[PDB]
Scaffold this active site. Structure first.
Site, mmCIF file in Angstrom:
data_model
loop_
_atom_site.group_PDB
_atom_site.id
_atom_site.type_symbol
_atom_site.label_atom_id
_atom_site.label_comp_id
_atom_site.label_asym_id
_atom_site.label_seq_id
_atom_site.Cartn_x
_atom_site.Cartn_y
_atom_site.Cartn_z
ATOM 1 N N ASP A 191 0.810 -1.197 0.000
ATOM 2 C CA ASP A 191 0.000 0.000 0.000
ATOM 3 C C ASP A 191 0.855 1.263 0.000
ATOM 4 O O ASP A 191 0.526 2.227 0.680
ATOM 5 C CB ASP A 191 -0.946 0.016 1.186
ATOM 6 C CG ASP A 191 -2.136 0.937 1.036
ATOM 7 O OD1 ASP A 191 -2.329 1.469 -0.080
ATOM 8 O OD2 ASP A 191 -2.817 1.163 2.051
ATOM 9 N N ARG A 251 -0.412 9.091 0.343
ATOM 10 C CA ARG A 251 -1.247 9.121 1.536
ATOM 11 C C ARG A 251 -0.617 8.358 2.705
ATOM 12 O O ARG A 251 -1.022 8.588 3.843
ATOM 13 C CB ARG A 251 -2.643 8.556 1.276
ATOM 14 C CG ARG A 251 -2.686 7.088 0.865
ATOM 15 C CD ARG A 251 -4.089 6.541 0.599
ATOM 16 N NE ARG A 251 -4.047 5.171 0.080
ATOM 17 C CZ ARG A 251 -3.812 4.860 -1.190
ATOM 18 N NH1 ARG A 251 -3.911 5.798 -2.100
ATOM 19 N NH2 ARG A 251 -3.602 3.609 -1.534
ATOM 20 N N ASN A 252 0.352 7.473 2.435
ATOM 21 C CA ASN A 252 0.975 6.626 3.457
ATOM 22 C C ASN A 252 2.451 6.982 3.642
ATOM 23 O O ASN A 252 3.269 6.162 4.075
ATOM 24 C CB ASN A 252 0.784 5.152 3.097
ATOM 25 C CG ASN A 252 -0.655 4.704 3.254
ATOM 26 O OD1 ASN A 252 -1.426 5.295 4.015
ATOM 27 N ND2 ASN A 252 -1.044 3.654 2.559
ATOM 28 N N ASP A 301 1.653 2.932 7.544
ATOM 29 C CA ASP A 301 0.480 2.124 7.241
ATOM 30 C C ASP A 301 0.867 0.734 6.741
ATOM 31 O O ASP A 301 0.978 0.491 5.544
ATOM 32 C CB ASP A 301 -0.496 2.764 6.276
ATOM 33 C CG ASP A 301 -1.897 2.189 6.403
ATOM 34 O OD1 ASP A 301 -2.013 0.948 6.626
ATOM 35 O OD2 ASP A 301 -2.854 2.972 6.272
HETATM 36 C C1 LIG Z 1 1.006 2.946 11.364
HETATM 37 O O1 LIG Z 1 1.709 3.967 12.042
HETATM 38 C C2 LIG Z 1 0.921 4.706 12.887
HETATM 39 C C3 LIG Z 1 0.835 4.301 14.212
HETATM 40 CL CL1 LIG Z 1 1.765 2.875 14.656
HETATM 41 C C4 LIG Z 1 0.050 5.034 15.083
HETATM 42 C C5 LIG Z 1 -0.640 6.161 14.657
HETATM 43 C C6 LIG Z 1 -0.560 6.573 13.334
HETATM 44 C C7 LIG Z 1 0.211 5.821 12.425
HETATM 45 N N1 LIG Z 1 0.400 6.229 11.089
HETATM 46 C C8 LIG Z 1 -0.349 7.193 10.419
HETATM 47 C C9 LIG Z 1 -0.469 8.562 10.632
HETATM 48 C C10 LIG Z 1 0.301 9.452 11.527
HETATM 49 C C11 LIG Z 1 1.463 9.031 12.192
HETATM 50 C C12 LIG Z 1 2.255 9.919 12.903
HETATM 51 N N2 LIG Z 1 1.976 11.214 12.943
HETATM 52 C C13 LIG Z 1 0.895 11.672 12.322
HETATM 53 C C14 LIG Z 1 0.055 10.850 11.586
HETATM 54 O O2 LIG Z 1 -1.050 11.341 10.951
HETATM 55 C C15 LIG Z 1 -0.845 12.588 10.269
HETATM 56 C C16 LIG Z 1 -2.007 12.757 9.317
HETATM 57 C C17 LIG Z 1 -3.319 12.751 10.100
HETATM 58 C C18 LIG Z 1 -4.265 11.882 9.227
HETATM 59 C C19 LIG Z 1 -3.414 11.698 7.957
HETATM 60 O O3 LIG Z 1 -2.083 11.652 8.448
HETATM 61 N N3 LIG Z 1 -1.338 9.031 9.643
HETATM 62 C C20 LIG Z 1 -1.774 8.045 8.873
HETATM 63 C C21 LIG Z 1 -1.196 6.862 9.286
HETATM 64 C C22 LIG Z 1 -1.563 5.565 8.668
HETATM 65 O O4 LIG Z 1 -1.260 4.440 9.130
HETATM 66 N N4 LIG Z 1 -2.245 5.641 7.535
HETATM 67 C C23 LIG Z 1 -2.580 6.877 6.843
HETATM 68 C C24 LIG Z 1 -2.752 8.103 7.733
#
Ligand SMILES: COc1c(Cl)cccc1Nc1c(-c2ccncc2OC[C@@H]2CCCO2)[nH]c2c1C(=O)NCC2
Length: 311
Positions: A136, A140-141, A154
């Site tokens: 994926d 976006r990821n 992701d």
């Molecule tokens: C998978 O790793 C994560 C874990 Cl372990 C915990 C929380 C978030 C994530 N990752 C992600 C964030 C994220 C991780 C760290 N800091 C900010 C974040 O989000 C920022 C913006 C907010 C919504 C879109 O992304 N945002 C996204 C993921 C994801 O897995 N898929 C797509 C959107």
């Protein structure tokens, strides 16, 4: 050796929704591990509501590929057991790279775009070395720690290949058709070389400052378009050598596509002469916040997935 550190709900304060979508809900919060006083900005993810089973699989993958020196892939800090199972990671304060390129188009110079391409390829090469097929990869990821430093995230679709395995064969779950290699659409086969296809689409997303691929074309038509030899168009900023990398990533023959190790080298070469390879009006006058800037602290202010229809 895959460990999951359990973090107590009470070690988290100031939890606030950051965003929602196909990935579930992501929150930001402050993690204060009892024993220390240090306050750590975190992101917290939970899935849409099976949810419990799925998210542990993502935790497992992330814990499996974790390492001491891991710059361009998100690291799992731990999990939290509340009314849901949540994953915990370090907050990436500048958000999603897709949103970032759309929002900051007017200050994104050639050096940044090429460096991001290098970093994503370095992250993917790391994952390939650990036998992980991401499945994926998309803008976006990819997340933005600083404008100069991105990380892949992701692991919802990611699979580890056993020592004997060259490929993963999927069942009937929803998959990101517009980012997938033709062989994945036709046969549900995924490899490190199908990740390379997705990498090419990701690069396209960045170089178009977050255009939607195959906009207005139904996902059901994509395999037919690819079979006719049609591909995503050349972005206006891209010189021919950059677009040819994308086109090589979208070759029909998977083993003829670039390897991530090659992409690192090619994009690194371009990053050494960025204005030769990307043509951006006003490039020299563009700046984004950097940690070495004295005022960097000011910046830290307070249907893509479809059921498969073939294979
Ligand atoms: C998978 O790793 C994560 C874990 Cl372990 C915990 C929380 C978030 C994530 N990752 C992600 C964030 C994220 C991780 C760290 N800091 C900010 C974040 O989000 C920022 C913006 C907010 C919504 C879109 O992304 N945002 C996204 C993921 C994801 O897995 N898929 C797509 C959107």
């Amino acid at each position: 050796q895959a460990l999951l550190r359990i973090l107590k709900e009470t070690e988290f304060k100031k939890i606030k929704v950051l965003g929602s979508g196909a990935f579930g809900t992501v929150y930001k919060g402050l993690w204060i591990p009892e024993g220390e006083k240090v306050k750590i900005p975190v992101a917290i993810k939970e899935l849409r509501e099976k949810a419990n089973k799925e998210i542990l699989d993502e935790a497992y993958v992330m814990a499996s590929v974790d390492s001491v020196d891991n710059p361009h892939v998100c690291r799992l800090l731990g999990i939290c057991l509340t009314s849901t199972v949540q994953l915990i990671t370090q907050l990436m304060p500048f958000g999603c790279l897709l949103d970032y390129v759309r929002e900051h188009k007017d200050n994104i110079g050639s050096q940044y775009l090429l460096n991001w391409c290098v970093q994503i390829a370095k992250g993917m090469n790391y994952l390939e070395d650990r036998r992980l097929v991401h499945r994926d990869l998309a803008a976006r990821n990819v997340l933005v720690k600083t404008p100069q430093h991105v990380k892949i995230t992701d692991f919802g679709l990611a699979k580890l290949l056993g020592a004997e395995e060259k490929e993963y064969h999927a069942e009937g779950g929803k998959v990101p058709i517009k980012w997938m290699a033709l062989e994945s659409i036709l046969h549900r086969i995924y490899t490190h070389q199908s990740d390379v296809w997705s990498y090419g689409v990701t690069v396209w997303e960045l170089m178009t400052f977050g255009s939607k691929p195959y906009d207005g074309i139904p996902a059901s038509e994509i395999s037919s378009i690819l079979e006719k030899g049609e591909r995503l168009p050349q972005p206006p900023i891209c010189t021919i050598d950059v677009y040819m990398i994308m086109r090589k990533c979208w070759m029909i023959d998977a083993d003829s596509r670039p390897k991530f190790r090659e992409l690192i080298i090619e994009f690194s070469k371009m990053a050494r002469d960025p204005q030769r390879y990307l043509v951006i009006q006003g490039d020299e006058r563009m700046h984004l916040p950097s940690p070495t800037d004295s005022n960097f602290y000011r910046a830290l202010m307070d249907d893509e997935y479809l059921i498969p229809q073939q294979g």
